[PDB]
Amino acid sequence: KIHPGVAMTVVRTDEILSENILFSSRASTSMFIGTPNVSRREARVDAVTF
Amino acid sequence: KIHPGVAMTVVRTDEILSENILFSSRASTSMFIGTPNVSRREARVDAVTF
C-alpha cells in the first residue's frame, strides 16, 4: 500500500439511457404527402399480398 | 459339390403386376371443389412458365 511516484487519473465512459423531449413550432415543416399506390406482389392461390 | 456345415434359407421377393378391382359404396366421401386459380412461376423472356 505504498503510494507510487506517479499519480493516476482514471477515465471511463458512461452510457445513460435518457428519455428525451422534442419541441417544434407551428409550421416547422411542410409535408407534400402524395397518394399511395398498390403493387400486387404475391398473387398466391392462398392469400394475396398487396 | 460337397455339403458345408451350415444350410441356408434363401429368401427373395417376387413382384407381380396385378390388374385390380376397386369398389366403393355410394356417398362414401364429401368433397368441396375449390375454384381453379392461375399463377405464373418463371417469367421467362422466351416462354413464361405458368
Side-chain angles (χ1 to χ4, degrees):
Chain A
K1 298 312 153 294
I2 300 294
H3 173 40
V6 299
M8 294 60 71
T9 181
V10 183
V11 192
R12 33 174 175 89
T13 69
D14 273 326
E15 176 43 78
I16 286 188
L17 176 75
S18 157
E19 314 196 324
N20 279 180
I21 294 184
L22 186 85
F23 189 45
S24 60
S25 310
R26 176 174 56 95
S28 181
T29 46
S30 42
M31 296 320 166
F32 306 117
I33 291 173
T35 40
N37 298 324
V38 161
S39 44
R40 170 167 50 247
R41 190 57 197 275
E42 178 57 47
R44 206 164 36 164
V45 289
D46 312 335
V48 177
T49 295
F50 293 106
Chain B
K1 206 63 76 172
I2 171 181
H3 200 302
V6 312
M8 301 83 80
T9 83
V10 176
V11 181
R12 31 161 172 86
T13 177
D14 298 339
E15 287 149 47
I16 173 68
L17 198 143
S18 83
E19 288 173 314
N20 286 14
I21 288 176
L22 177 71
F23 181 54
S24 198
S25 62
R26 76 146 181 98
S28 157
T29 43
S30 158
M31 261 163 38
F32 315 105
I33 301 306
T35 316
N37 294 141
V38 204
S39 44
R40 324 180 314 156
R41 294 260 297 196
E42 191 266 324
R44 186 61 171 80
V45 199
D46 304 333
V48 289
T49 310
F50 262 59

Coordinates of all heavy atoms in Angstrom, one line a residue:
Chain A
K1 N 0.8 -1.2 0.0 CA 0.0 0.0 0.0 C 0.9 1.3 0.0 O 0.5 2.3 0.6 CB -1.0 0.0 1.2 CG -2.0 -1.1 1.1 CD -2.7 -1.3 -0.2 CE -3.1 -2.7 -0.4 NZ -2.0 -3.6 -0.5
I2 N 2.0 1.2 -0.7 CA 2.8 2.4 -0.8 C 2.4 3.2 -2.0 O 2.2 2.7 -3.1 CB 4.3 2.0 -1.0 CG1 4.8 1.1 0.2 CG2 5.2 3.2 -1.2 CD1 4.8 2.0 1.4
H3 N 2.1 4.5 -1.8 CA 1.8 5.4 -2.9 C 2.9 5.6 -3.8 O 4.0 6.0 -3.4 CB 1.4 6.8 -2.3 CG 1.1 7.8 -3.3 ND1 0.5 7.6 -4.5 CD2 1.5 9.1 -3.3 CE1 0.4 8.7 -5.2 NE2 1.0 9.7 -4.5
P4 N 2.7 5.3 -5.1 CA 3.9 5.4 -6.1 C 4.3 6.8 -6.4 O 3.8 7.8 -5.9 CB 3.3 4.7 -7.4 CG 2.1 3.9 -6.9 CD 1.6 4.7 -5.8
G5 N 5.4 6.9 -7.2 CA 5.9 8.2 -7.6 C 5.1 8.9 -8.7 O 5.3 10.0 -9.0
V6 N 4.0 8.2 -9.2 CA 3.1 8.8 -10.2 C 1.7 8.8 -9.6 O 1.4 8.0 -8.8 CB 3.2 8.1 -11.6 CG1 4.6 8.2 -12.1 CG2 2.8 6.7 -11.4
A7 N 0.9 9.7 -10.2 CA -0.5 9.9 -9.8 C -1.4 9.5 -11.0 O -1.1 10.0 -12.1 CB -0.8 11.3 -9.3
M8 N -2.3 8.7 -10.8 CA -3.2 8.1 -11.8 C -4.5 8.8 -11.8 O -5.2 8.9 -10.8 CB -3.3 6.6 -11.7 CG -2.0 5.8 -11.8 SD -0.7 6.2 -10.7 CE -1.4 5.5 -9.1
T9 N -4.9 9.3 -13.0 CA -6.3 9.8 -13.2 C -7.0 8.7 -14.0 O -6.5 8.2 -15.0 CB -6.4 11.2 -13.8 OG1 -7.8 11.6 -13.9 CG2 -5.7 11.3 -15.1
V10 N -8.2 8.3 -13.6 CA -8.9 7.2 -14.2 C -10.1 7.7 -14.9 O -11.0 8.4 -14.4 CB -9.3 6.2 -13.1 CG1 -10.0 5.0 -13.7 CG2 -8.1 5.8 -12.3
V11 N -10.1 7.4 -16.2 CA -11.1 7.9 -17.1 C -12.0 6.8 -17.6 O -11.5 5.8 -18.1 CB -10.5 8.6 -18.3 CG1 -11.5 9.4 -19.1 CG2 -9.4 9.5 -17.9
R12 N -13.3 6.9 -17.5 CA -14.2 5.9 -18.0 C -15.4 6.6 -18.7 O -15.9 7.6 -18.2 CB -14.8 5.0 -16.9 CG -14.9 5.7 -15.6 CD -15.6 4.8 -14.6 NE -15.6 5.4 -13.2 CZ -16.6 6.2 -12.8 NH1 -17.6 6.5 -13.6 NH2 -16.5 6.7 -11.6
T13 N -15.9 6.1 -19.8 CA -17.1 6.5 -20.4 C -18.3 6.0 -19.6 O -18.1 5.1 -18.7 CB -17.3 6.0 -21.8 OG1 -17.4 4.6 -21.9 CG2 -16.1 6.4 -22.7
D14 N -19.5 6.5 -19.8 CA -20.7 6.1 -19.2 C -21.8 6.2 -20.2 O -22.0 7.2 -20.9 CB -20.9 6.9 -17.9 CG -20.2 6.3 -16.7 OD1 -20.1 5.1 -16.7 OD2 -19.8 7.1 -15.8
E15 N -22.6 5.1 -20.2 CA -23.8 5.1 -21.1 C -25.0 5.3 -20.2 O -25.3 4.6 -19.2 CB -23.9 3.7 -21.8 CG -25.2 3.6 -22.6 CD -25.5 4.8 -23.4 OE1 -24.8 5.0 -24.5 OE2 -26.4 5.5 -23.0
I16 N -25.8 6.3 -20.5 CA -27.0 6.7 -19.8 C -28.2 6.7 -20.7 O -28.2 7.5 -21.6 CB -26.8 8.0 -19.0 CG1 -25.8 7.8 -17.9 CG2 -28.1 8.6 -18.6 CD1 -25.7 9.0 -17.0
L17 N -29.2 5.9 -20.4 CA -30.4 5.8 -21.2 C -31.3 7.0 -20.8 O -31.9 7.1 -19.8 CB -31.1 4.5 -21.0 CG -32.5 4.4 -21.6 CD1 -32.3 4.1 -23.1 CD2 -33.3 3.3 -21.0
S18 N -31.3 8.0 -21.7 CA -32.1 9.2 -21.4 C -33.5 9.0 -21.9 O -33.8 8.0 -22.6 CB -31.6 10.4 -22.1 OG -32.6 11.4 -22.3
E19 N -34.4 9.9 -21.6 CA -35.8 9.9 -22.1 C -36.0 11.3 -22.6 O -36.3 12.3 -21.8 CB -36.8 9.6 -21.0 CG -36.4 8.4 -20.1 CD -37.6 7.8 -19.3 OE1 -38.4 8.6 -18.8 OE2 -37.6 6.6 -19.1
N20 N -35.9 11.5 -23.9 CA -35.8 12.8 -24.5 C -37.1 13.5 -24.7 O -38.2 12.9 -24.8 CB -35.0 12.8 -25.8 CG -33.5 12.7 -25.5 OD1 -32.7 12.6 -26.5 ND2 -33.1 12.7 -24.3
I21 N -37.0 14.9 -24.8 CA -38.2 15.7 -25.1 C -37.9 16.4 -26.4 O -36.9 17.1 -26.5 CB -38.4 16.7 -23.9 CG1 -38.9 16.0 -22.7 CG2 -39.5 17.7 -24.3 CD1 -39.3 16.9 -21.5
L22 N -38.9 16.4 -27.3 CA -38.8 17.1 -28.6 C -39.7 18.3 -28.5 O -40.9 18.2 -28.0 CB -39.2 16.1 -29.7 CG -39.0 16.7 -31.1 CD1 -37.6 16.5 -31.6 CD2 -40.0 16.0 -32.1
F23 N -39.3 19.4 -29.1 CA -40.2 20.5 -29.4 C -40.1 20.8 -30.9 O -39.0 20.5 -31.5 CB -39.8 21.8 -28.6 CG -40.8 22.9 -28.7 CD1 -42.2 22.6 -28.6 CD2 -40.4 24.2 -28.9 CE1 -43.1 23.7 -28.8 CE2 -41.3 25.2 -29.0 CZ -42.6 24.9 -28.9
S24 N -41.1 21.4 -31.4 CA -41.1 22.0 -32.8 C -42.2 23.0 -32.9 O -43.3 22.8 -32.3 CB -41.2 20.9 -33.8 OG -42.4 20.2 -33.7
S25 N -42.0 24.1 -33.6 CA -43.0 25.1 -33.6 C -44.2 24.8 -34.6 O -44.1 23.7 -35.2 CB -42.4 26.5 -34.0 OG -41.3 26.8 -33.2
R26 N -45.1 25.7 -34.6 CA -46.2 25.5 -35.6 C -45.7 25.9 -37.0 O -45.0 26.9 -37.1 CB -47.4 26.5 -35.2 CG -48.5 26.5 -36.3 CD -49.6 27.4 -35.7 NE -49.2 28.7 -35.4 CZ -49.3 29.7 -36.2 NH1 -49.8 29.6 -37.4 NH2 -48.8 30.9 -35.8
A27 N -46.0 25.0 -37.9 CA -45.5 25.0 -39.3 C -44.0 25.0 -39.3 O -43.3 25.9 -40.0 CB -46.1 26.2 -40.1
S28 N -43.4 24.1 -38.5 CA -42.0 23.9 -38.6 C -41.6 23.3 -39.9 O -40.6 23.7 -40.5 CB -41.6 22.9 -37.5 OG -40.2 22.7 -37.5
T29 N -42.3 22.3 -40.4 CA -42.1 21.8 -41.7 C -43.3 21.8 -42.5 O -44.4 22.4 -42.1 CB -41.5 20.3 -41.6 OG1 -42.3 19.6 -40.7 CG2 -40.1 20.3 -41.2
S30 N -43.3 21.2 -43.7 CA -44.4 21.1 -44.6 C -44.4 19.8 -45.4 O -43.4 19.6 -46.0 CB -44.5 22.3 -45.5 OG -43.2 22.6 -46.1
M31 N -45.4 19.0 -45.3 CA -45.4 17.7 -45.9 C -46.2 17.7 -47.2 O -47.4 18.0 -47.2 CB -45.9 16.6 -44.9 CG -45.1 16.4 -43.7 SD -43.3 16.5 -44.1 CE -42.6 16.7 -42.5
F32 N -45.5 17.3 -48.3 CA -46.2 17.1 -49.5 C -46.4 15.6 -49.6 O -45.7 14.8 -50.2 CB -45.3 17.6 -50.7 CG -44.9 19.0 -50.5 CD1 -43.6 19.3 -50.4 CD2 -45.9 20.0 -50.5 CE1 -43.2 20.6 -50.3 CE2 -45.5 21.3 -50.4 CZ -44.2 21.6 -50.3
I33 N -47.6 15.2 -49.0 CA -47.9 13.8 -49.0 C -48.7 13.4 -50.2 O -49.8 14.0 -50.4 CB -48.6 13.4 -47.7 CG1 -47.7 13.6 -46.5 CG2 -49.2 12.1 -47.7 CD1 -48.4 13.4 -45.1
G34 N -48.2 12.5 -51.0 CA -48.9 12.0 -52.2 C -49.7 10.8 -51.9 O -49.7 10.2 -50.9
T35 N -50.6 10.5 -52.9 CA -51.4 9.3 -52.8 C -50.6 8.0 -52.9 O -49.8 7.9 -53.8 CB -52.5 9.3 -53.8 OG1 -52.0 9.8 -55.0 CG2 -53.6 10.3 -53.4
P36 N -50.8 7.0 -52.0 CA -50.1 5.8 -52.1 C -50.6 4.9 -53.2 O -51.7 4.9 -53.6 CB -50.2 5.2 -50.7 CG -51.5 5.7 -50.2 CD -51.6 7.1 -50.7
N37 N -49.7 3.9 -53.6 CA -50.0 3.1 -54.7 C -50.1 1.6 -54.2 O -50.0 1.3 -53.1 CB -48.9 3.2 -55.8 CG -48.8 4.6 -56.3 OD1 -49.9 5.2 -56.5 ND2 -47.6 5.0 -56.6
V38 N -50.5 0.8 -55.2 CA -50.7 -0.7 -55.0 C -49.9 -1.4 -56.0 O -50.1 -1.2 -57.2 CB -52.2 -1.0 -55.0 CG1 -52.4 -2.5 -55.2 CG2 -52.8 -0.6 -53.7
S39 N -49.1 -2.4 -55.6 CA -48.4 -3.3 -56.5 C -48.6 -4.7 -55.9 O -48.1 -5.0 -54.9 CB -47.0 -3.0 -56.6 OG -46.4 -2.7 -55.4
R40 N -49.4 -5.6 -56.7 CA -49.6 -6.9 -56.2 C -48.3 -7.7 -56.3 O -47.8 -8.0 -57.3 CB -50.7 -7.6 -57.0 CG -50.8 -9.1 -56.7 CD -52.1 -9.7 -57.2 NE -52.3 -9.4 -58.7 CZ -53.3 -8.6 -59.1 NH1 -54.2 -8.1 -58.2 NH2 -53.5 -8.4 -60.4
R41 N -47.8 -8.0 -55.1 CA -46.5 -8.8 -55.1 C -46.8 -10.3 -55.2 O -46.3 -10.9 -56.1 CB -45.7 -8.4 -53.8 CG -44.3 -9.0 -53.8 CD -43.6 -8.4 -55.0 NE -42.4 -9.2 -55.3 CZ -41.2 -9.0 -54.7 NH1 -41.1 -8.0 -53.8 NH2 -40.2 -9.8 -55.0
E42 N -47.5 -10.8 -54.2 CA -47.8 -12.3 -54.2 C -49.2 -12.5 -54.6 O -50.1 -12.3 -53.9 CB -47.5 -12.8 -52.7 CG -47.8 -14.3 -52.6 CD -47.0 -15.1 -53.5 OE1 -45.7 -14.9 -53.6 OE2 -47.5 -16.0 -54.1
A43 N -49.3 -13.1 -55.9 CA -50.6 -13.5 -56.4 C -50.8 -15.0 -56.1 O -50.9 -15.8 -57.0 CB -50.7 -13.1 -57.9
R44 N -50.7 -15.3 -54.8 CA -50.9 -16.7 -54.4 C -52.3 -17.2 -54.6 O -53.2 -16.4 -54.8 CB -50.5 -16.8 -52.9 CG -50.0 -18.1 -52.4 CD -49.3 -18.0 -51.0 NE -50.0 -17.0 -50.2 CZ -49.8 -16.9 -48.9 NH1 -49.0 -17.8 -48.2 NH2 -50.4 -16.0 -48.1
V45 N -52.4 -18.5 -54.6 CA -53.7 -19.2 -54.5 C -54.3 -19.2 -53.1 O -55.4 -19.5 -52.9 CB -53.7 -20.6 -55.1 CG1 -53.6 -20.5 -56.6 CG2 -52.6 -21.4 -54.5
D46 N -53.4 -18.9 -52.1 CA -53.8 -19.0 -50.7 C -54.3 -17.6 -50.2 O -55.5 -17.5 -49.8 CB -52.6 -19.5 -49.9 CG -51.9 -20.7 -50.5 OD1 -52.6 -21.4 -51.2 OD2 -50.7 -20.9 -50.2
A47 N -53.5 -16.6 -50.2 CA -53.9 -15.3 -49.8 C -53.0 -14.3 -50.6 O -51.8 -14.5 -50.7 CB -53.7 -15.1 -48.3
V48 N -53.7 -13.2 -51.1 CA -53.0 -12.2 -51.9 C -52.3 -11.2 -51.1 O -53.0 -10.6 -50.1 CB -54.0 -11.6 -52.9 CG1 -53.4 -10.5 -53.8 CG2 -54.6 -12.7 -53.8
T49 N -51.1 -10.9 -51.4 CA -50.3 -9.9 -50.6 C -50.1 -8.7 -51.5 O -49.4 -8.7 -52.5 CB -49.0 -10.4 -50.2 OG1 -49.2 -11.5 -49.2 CG2 -48.1 -9.4 -49.5
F50 N -50.7 -7.5 -51.1 CA -50.5 -6.3 -51.8 C -49.5 -5.5 -51.0 O -49.7 -5.1 -49.8 CB -51.8 -5.5 -51.9 CG -52.8 -6.1 -52.8 CD1 -53.9 -6.7 -52.3 CD2 -52.6 -6.0 -54.2 CE1 -54.9 -7.3 -53.2 CE2 -53.6 -6.6 -55.0 CZ -54.7 -7.2 -54.5
Chain B
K1 N -19.0 -79.8 -54.9 CA -20.4 -80.1 -54.7 C -20.5 -80.9 -53.3 O -21.3 -81.8 -53.2 CB -21.0 -80.9 -55.8 CG -22.5 -80.8 -56.0 CD -22.9 -79.3 -56.3 CE -22.7 -79.0 -57.7 NZ -23.2 -77.6 -58.0
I2 N -19.7 -80.5 -52.4 CA -19.7 -81.1 -51.1 C -20.4 -80.2 -50.1 O -20.3 -79.0 -50.2 CB -18.2 -81.4 -50.6 CG1 -18.1 -81.9 -49.2 CG2 -17.3 -80.2 -50.9 CD1 -16.7 -82.1 -48.8
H3 N -21.2 -80.8 -49.2 CA -22.1 -80.1 -48.3 C -21.2 -79.3 -47.3 O -20.3 -79.9 -46.6 CB -23.0 -81.0 -47.6 CG -24.2 -80.4 -47.0 ND1 -24.1 -79.3 -46.1 CD2 -25.5 -80.6 -47.2 CE1 -25.4 -78.9 -45.8 NE2 -26.2 -79.7 -46.4
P4 N -21.5 -78.1 -47.1 CA -20.8 -77.4 -45.9 C -21.5 -77.7 -44.6 O -22.5 -78.5 -44.6 CB -21.0 -75.9 -46.3 CG -22.3 -75.9 -47.1 CD -22.3 -77.2 -47.9
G5 N -21.0 -77.1 -43.5 CA -21.6 -77.5 -42.2 C -23.0 -76.8 -42.0 O -23.7 -77.3 -41.2
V6 N -23.3 -75.7 -42.7 CA -24.5 -75.0 -42.5 C -25.4 -75.2 -43.7 O -25.0 -75.7 -44.7 CB -24.2 -73.5 -42.2 CG1 -23.1 -73.3 -41.2 CG2 -23.8 -72.8 -43.5
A7 N -26.6 -74.8 -43.5 CA -27.6 -74.7 -44.6 C -28.1 -73.3 -44.7 O -27.6 -72.4 -44.0 CB -28.8 -75.6 -44.3
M8 N -28.9 -73.0 -45.7 CA -29.4 -71.7 -46.0 C -30.9 -71.7 -46.0 O -31.6 -72.7 -46.1 CB -28.9 -71.3 -47.4 CG -27.3 -71.2 -47.5 SD -26.6 -72.9 -47.9 CE -26.9 -72.9 -49.6
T9 N -31.4 -70.5 -45.8 CA -32.9 -70.2 -46.1 C -32.8 -69.0 -47.1 O -32.9 -67.9 -46.7 CB -33.7 -69.9 -44.9 OG1 -33.5 -68.5 -44.6 CG2 -33.3 -70.7 -43.7
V10 N -32.8 -69.4 -48.4 CA -32.6 -68.4 -49.4 C -34.0 -67.7 -49.6 O -35.0 -68.3 -49.8 CB -32.2 -69.0 -50.7 CG1 -32.2 -68.0 -51.8 CG2 -30.8 -69.7 -50.6
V11 N -34.0 -66.3 -49.4 CA -35.2 -65.5 -49.4 C -35.1 -64.5 -50.5 O -34.1 -63.7 -50.6 CB -35.4 -64.9 -48.1 CG1 -36.7 -64.1 -48.1 CG2 -35.5 -65.9 -47.0
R12 N -36.0 -64.4 -51.4 CA -36.2 -63.4 -52.4 C -37.6 -62.8 -52.3 O -38.5 -63.4 -51.7 CB -35.9 -63.9 -53.8 CG -36.2 -65.3 -54.0 CD -36.3 -65.6 -55.5 NE -36.5 -67.0 -55.7 CZ -37.7 -67.7 -55.7 NH1 -38.8 -67.0 -55.5 NH2 -37.7 -69.0 -56.0
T13 N -37.8 -61.7 -53.0 CA -39.2 -61.2 -53.2 C -39.5 -61.4 -54.7 O -38.6 -61.4 -55.6 CB -39.3 -59.8 -52.8 OG1 -40.6 -59.3 -53.0 CG2 -38.3 -58.9 -53.5
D14 N -40.8 -61.5 -55.0 CA -41.3 -61.7 -56.4 C -42.4 -60.6 -56.6 O -43.5 -60.7 -56.0 CB -41.9 -63.1 -56.6 CG -40.8 -64.2 -56.4 OD1 -39.6 -63.9 -56.5 OD2 -41.2 -65.3 -56.1
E15 N -42.1 -59.7 -57.5 CA -43.1 -58.8 -57.9 C -44.1 -59.4 -58.9 O -43.8 -60.4 -59.5 CB -42.5 -57.5 -58.6 CG -41.7 -56.7 -57.6 CD -40.6 -55.9 -58.2 OE1 -40.7 -55.4 -59.3 OE2 -39.5 -56.0 -57.6
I16 N -45.3 -58.8 -58.9 CA -46.4 -59.2 -59.8 C -47.3 -58.0 -60.1 O -47.8 -57.4 -59.2 CB -47.2 -60.4 -59.3 CG1 -48.4 -60.7 -60.2 CG2 -47.6 -60.3 -57.8 CD1 -48.0 -61.3 -61.5
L17 N -47.4 -57.8 -61.4 CA -48.3 -56.7 -61.8 C -49.7 -57.3 -61.9 O -50.0 -58.2 -62.6 CB -47.9 -56.2 -63.2 CG -48.5 -54.8 -63.6 CD1 -47.5 -54.0 -64.4 CD2 -49.8 -55.0 -64.4
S18 N -50.6 -56.7 -61.0 CA -51.9 -57.3 -60.8 C -53.0 -56.3 -61.3 O -53.0 -55.2 -60.7 CB -52.2 -57.7 -59.4 OG -52.6 -56.5 -58.6
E19 N -53.8 -56.6 -62.2 CA -55.0 -55.8 -62.6 C -56.0 -55.9 -61.4 O -56.4 -57.0 -61.1 CB -55.6 -56.3 -63.9 CG -54.8 -56.0 -65.1 CD -55.4 -56.6 -66.4 OE1 -55.7 -57.8 -66.3 OE2 -55.5 -55.9 -67.4
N20 N -56.3 -54.8 -60.8 CA -57.1 -54.8 -59.6 C -58.5 -54.2 -59.9 O -58.7 -53.6 -60.8 CB -56.4 -54.1 -58.5 CG -55.2 -54.8 -57.9 OD1 -54.8 -55.8 -58.5 ND2 -54.8 -54.4 -56.7
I21 N -59.4 -54.5 -58.9 CA -60.7 -54.0 -59.0 C -61.0 -53.3 -57.7 O -60.8 -53.8 -56.6 CB -61.8 -55.2 -59.1 CG1 -61.7 -55.7 -60.6 CG2 -63.2 -54.7 -58.8 CD1 -62.6 -56.9 -60.8
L22 N -61.4 -52.0 -57.8 CA -61.7 -51.2 -56.7 C -63.2 -51.0 -56.5 O -63.9 -50.8 -57.5 CB -61.0 -49.8 -56.8 CG -61.3 -48.8 -55.7 CD1 -60.6 -49.2 -54.5 CD2 -60.8 -47.4 -56.1
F23 N -63.7 -51.1 -55.3 CA -65.1 -50.9 -55.0 C -65.2 -49.9 -54.0 O -64.4 -49.8 -53.0 CB -65.8 -52.2 -54.6 CG -67.2 -52.0 -54.3 CD1 -68.1 -51.5 -55.2 CD2 -67.7 -52.4 -53.1 CE1 -69.4 -51.3 -55.0 CE2 -69.1 -52.2 -52.8 CZ -69.9 -51.7 -53.7
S24 N -66.3 -49.0 -54.1 CA -66.6 -48.1 -53.0 C -68.1 -47.9 -53.1 O -68.7 -47.8 -54.2 CB -65.9 -46.8 -53.2 OG -65.9 -46.1 -52.0
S25 N -68.7 -47.7 -51.9 CA -70.2 -47.5 -51.8 C -70.5 -46.1 -52.2 O -69.7 -45.2 -52.4 CB -70.6 -47.8 -50.4 OG -70.0 -46.9 -49.5
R26 N -71.8 -45.9 -52.4 CA -72.3 -44.5 -52.8 C -72.2 -43.6 -51.5 O -72.4 -44.1 -50.4 CB -73.7 -44.6 -53.4 CG -74.8 -44.7 -52.4 CD -76.1 -44.0 -52.9 NE -77.2 -44.1 -52.0 CZ -77.5 -43.2 -51.0 NH1 -76.8 -42.1 -50.9 NH2 -78.6 -43.4 -50.2
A27 N -72.0 -42.3 -51.8 CA -71.8 -41.3 -50.8 C -70.8 -41.7 -49.7 O -71.1 -41.6 -48.5 CB -73.2 -40.9 -50.2
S28 N -69.6 -42.1 -50.2 CA -68.6 -42.5 -49.3 C -67.9 -41.3 -48.7 O -67.5 -41.3 -47.5 CB -67.6 -43.4 -49.9 OG -66.4 -43.4 -49.3
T29 N -67.7 -40.3 -49.5 CA -66.9 -39.1 -49.1 C -67.7 -37.8 -49.5 O -68.5 -37.9 -50.5 CB -65.5 -39.0 -49.7 OG1 -65.6 -39.4 -51.0 CG2 -64.6 -40.0 -48.9
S30 N -67.5 -36.7 -48.8 CA -67.9 -35.4 -49.2 C -66.8 -34.6 -49.7 O -65.7 -34.6 -49.0 CB -68.7 -34.7 -48.1 OG -68.7 -33.3 -48.3
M31 N -67.0 -33.8 -50.7 CA -65.9 -33.1 -51.4 C -66.3 -31.7 -51.7 O -67.4 -31.4 -52.1 CB -65.5 -33.8 -52.7 CG -64.3 -34.7 -52.6 SD -64.2 -35.9 -54.0 CE -64.8 -34.9 -55.3
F32 N -65.4 -30.8 -51.4 CA -65.5 -29.4 -51.6 C -64.6 -29.1 -52.8 O -63.3 -29.1 -52.6 CB -65.2 -28.5 -50.4 CG -65.8 -29.0 -49.1 CD1 -65.0 -29.7 -48.2 CD2 -67.1 -28.9 -48.9 CE1 -65.6 -30.2 -47.0 CE2 -67.7 -29.3 -47.7 CZ -66.9 -30.0 -46.8
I33 N -65.1 -28.7 -53.9 CA -64.3 -28.5 -55.1 C -64.0 -27.0 -55.1 O -64.8 -26.1 -55.4 CB -65.0 -28.9 -56.4 CG1 -65.3 -30.4 -56.4 CG2 -64.1 -28.6 -57.6 CD1 -64.1 -31.2 -56.1
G34 N -62.7 -26.6 -54.8 CA -62.3 -25.3 -55.0 C -62.2 -24.8 -56.4 O -61.9 -25.6 -57.3
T35 N -62.4 -23.5 -56.6 CA -62.3 -23.0 -58.0 C -60.8 -23.0 -58.4 O -59.9 -22.6 -57.6 CB -62.8 -21.6 -58.0 OG1 -64.1 -21.5 -57.3 CG2 -63.1 -21.1 -59.4
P36 N -60.5 -23.4 -59.6 CA -59.1 -23.4 -60.1 C -58.6 -21.9 -60.3 O -59.3 -21.0 -60.7 CB -59.2 -24.1 -61.5 CG -60.6 -24.0 -61.8 CD -61.4 -24.1 -60.6
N37 N -57.3 -21.8 -60.0 CA -56.7 -20.4 -60.0 C -55.3 -20.5 -60.6 O -54.6 -21.5 -60.4 CB -56.7 -19.9 -58.5 CG -58.0 -19.6 -58.0 OD1 -58.3 -19.8 -56.8 ND2 -58.9 -19.1 -58.8
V38 N -54.9 -19.5 -61.3 CA -53.7 -19.5 -62.1 C -52.7 -18.7 -61.4 O -53.0 -17.7 -60.7 CB -54.0 -18.9 -63.5 CG1 -53.0 -19.4 -64.5 CG2 -55.4 -19.2 -63.9
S39 N -51.4 -19.0 -61.6 CA -50.3 -18.3 -61.1 C -49.1 -18.5 -61.9 O -48.7 -19.6 -62.3 CB -50.0 -18.8 -59.6 OG -50.0 -20.2 -59.5
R40 N -48.4 -17.4 -62.3 CA -47.2 -17.5 -63.1 C -46.1 -17.9 -62.1 O -46.1 -17.5 -61.0 CB -46.9 -16.2 -63.8 CG -48.1 -15.5 -64.3 CD -47.6 -14.2 -65.0 NE -46.7 -13.4 -64.2 CZ -45.8 -12.5 -64.6 NH1 -45.8 -12.3 -65.9 NH2 -45.0 -11.9 -63.8
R41 N -45.1 -18.7 -62.6 CA -44.0 -19.1 -61.8 C -42.7 -18.5 -62.3 O -42.0 -17.8 -61.5 CB -43.9 -20.7 -61.8 CG -45.1 -21.3 -61.1 CD -44.8 -21.7 -59.7 NE -43.7 -22.7 -59.7 CZ -43.4 -23.5 -58.6 NH1 -44.2 -23.3 -57.5 NH2 -42.5 -24.4 -58.6
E42 N -42.3 -18.8 -63.5 CA -41.0 -18.4 -64.0 C -41.3 -17.5 -65.3 O -41.5 -18.1 -66.3 CB -40.1 -19.5 -64.3 CG -38.6 -19.1 -64.6 CD -38.3 -19.0 -66.1 OE1 -38.9 -19.8 -66.8 OE2 -37.6 -18.1 -66.4
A43 N -41.2 -16.2 -65.1 CA -41.5 -15.3 -66.2 C -40.3 -15.2 -67.1 O -39.5 -14.3 -67.1 CB -41.8 -13.9 -65.7
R44 N -40.1 -16.3 -67.9 CA -39.0 -16.4 -68.9 C -39.3 -15.4 -70.0 O -40.4 -15.1 -70.4 CB -38.9 -17.8 -69.5 CG -37.8 -18.1 -70.4 CD -36.5 -17.9 -69.7 NE -35.3 -18.4 -70.5 CZ -34.8 -17.7 -71.5 NH1 -35.3 -16.5 -71.8 NH2 -33.8 -18.2 -72.1
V45 N -38.2 -14.8 -70.6 CA -38.3 -13.9 -71.7 C -38.7 -14.6 -73.0 O -39.3 -14.0 -73.9 CB -37.0 -13.1 -71.8 CG1 -37.2 -11.8 -72.6 CG2 -36.4 -12.7 -70.5
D46 N -38.3 -15.9 -73.1 CA -38.8 -16.7 -74.2 C -40.2 -17.1 -74.0 O -41.2 -16.7 -74.7 CB -37.9 -17.9 -74.5 CG -36.5 -17.5 -74.6 OD1 -36.2 -16.3 -75.1 OD2 -35.6 -18.3 -74.4
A47 N -40.5 -18.0 -73.0 CA -41.8 -18.6 -72.8 C -42.0 -18.7 -71.3 O -41.4 -19.5 -70.6 CB -41.8 -20.0 -73.5
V48 N -43.0 -18.0 -70.8 CA -43.3 -17.9 -69.4 C -43.9 -19.2 -68.9 O -44.7 -19.9 -69.5 CB -44.3 -16.7 -69.1 CG1 -43.6 -15.4 -69.3 CG2 -45.5 -16.8 -70.1
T49 N -43.4 -19.6 -67.7 CA -43.7 -20.9 -67.1 C -45.0 -20.7 -66.2 O -44.8 -20.1 -65.1 CB -42.6 -21.5 -66.3 OG1 -41.4 -21.5 -67.1 CG2 -42.9 -22.9 -65.9
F50 N -46.1 -21.1 -66.7 CA -47.3 -20.9 -66.0 C -47.5 -22.0 -64.8 O -46.6 -22.8 -64.6 CB -48.5 -21.0 -66.9 CG -49.0 -19.6 -67.3 CD1 -48.1 -18.8 -68.0 CD2 -50.3 -19.2 -67.1 CE1 -48.6 -17.5 -68.4 CE2 -50.7 -18.0 -67.5 CZ -49.9 -17.1 -68.1

